[PDB]
Write a protein that binds this ligand. Sequence first.
Ligand SMILES: NC(=O)C1=CN([C@@H]2O[C@H](COP(=O)(O)OP(=O)(O)OC[C@H]3O[C@@H](n4cnc5c(N)ncnc54)[C@H](OP(=O)(O)O)[C@@H]3O)[C@@H](O)[C@H]2O)C=CC1
Length: 416
Amino acid sequence: IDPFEMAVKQLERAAQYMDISEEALEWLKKPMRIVEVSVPIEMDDGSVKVFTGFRVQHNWARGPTKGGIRWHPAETLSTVKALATWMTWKVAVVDLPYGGGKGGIIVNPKELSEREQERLARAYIRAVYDVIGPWTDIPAPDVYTNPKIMGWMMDEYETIMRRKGPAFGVITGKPLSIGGSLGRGTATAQGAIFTIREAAKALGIDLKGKKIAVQGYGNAGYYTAKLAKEQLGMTVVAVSDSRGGIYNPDGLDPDEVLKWKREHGSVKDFPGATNITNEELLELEVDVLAPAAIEEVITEKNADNIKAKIVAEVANGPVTPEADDILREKGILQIPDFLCNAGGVTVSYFEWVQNINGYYWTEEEVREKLDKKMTKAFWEVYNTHKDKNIHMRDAAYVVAVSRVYQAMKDRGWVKK
Ligand SMILES: NC(=O)C1=CN([C@@H]2O[C@H](COP(=O)(O)OP(=O)(O)OC[C@H]3O[C@@H](n4cnc5c(N)ncnc54)[C@H](OP(=O)(O)O)[C@@H]3O)[C@@H](O)[C@H]2O)C=CC1
């Protein structure tokens, strides 16, 4: 299924639940600027290889576009366009002064050395300099890209820009030594925890003493479990990895589970815990479920057999639309995927603000501002959900598209 076709279909579906003009929908169905460039680098053997780079800016009505850069051998312009379109709604739902953007290079980084990767980053910056900037387009880490490459890109941009402004703010996800930000490691989990707390508040459920099951124990899953147990006081009873999952009604200690995973290569066979399958974890009777793993783990087949009161879509779309309808019919509140894991984008914006202002905050200030942002966004989505009598995800889409629509109307881009 073509990614851009899917994104356009999603946008039309969202527009079907709100009052939006045809001209605005047509404007939103097409990225405002797409830049495809050749990225030449010098190989370690002395040869020269040319790579294909992309930089799609879907919309900038609300402000400078924001989005990451992906280094995947299967990158396509369609995928970049779809991800920029999704990033637009991602930044619009949580009320950031950002638009939608995305980049990508068709390259396999597993076969490149450190020098070649640095050359690739610098050449990409040299190619796309004319369409990026602190107030035009702010790239970010993505798949097979890390803060190392962010530092290289920032250094190249500063070299080209002759230090005429906040070159630190041109890109986010940088190392702390050069314009970096605190709380970037646990941003997604912190946002998910705040959204879960607000959902419990909305449902009238006290989380102190309740049970939570987390699917996927990577950076997001482990930190979600850890932060839930620490702040929310929720008993973690089940975690899982690719290999399998474990269960214990008496509770799990996330630090010990992480230690065992980093020692035995997997979370399975944890002492005092019963081994369960991922499917079996989705079956447990808990009050919070946090899929932080592979996409499409909840389908029409197992949607009915879910007993969780709150499903926090920490991952990127772990629930299918049929499963969405079935789960909504069962009186279960869903937190949409691009609202639950909004911490990442929310944190990036804080980093950009720190770079622009020249003043960096502390871990507590970032945590409090993120708390405010996520609470406001979830509350703005839940109110739409209750007023329009539509699905949770649909409420978030309505909020984001309404925000973009209003910004477009204010600029005079669309007269209707
Ligand atoms: N973490 C972040 O900063 C943000 C995360 N996201 C989204 O969040 C999710 C996780 O992020 P991230 O922590 O970076 O991912 P990680 O790569 O750090 O970890 C992936 C985890 O999910 C597990 N996993 C991978 N495939 C499966 C599978 N088929 N079945 C069951 N478990 C699987 C991995 O298991 P194993 O360890 O055994 O390999 C691991 O536990 C993703 O869906 C991602 O798209 C996007 C926004 C930013």
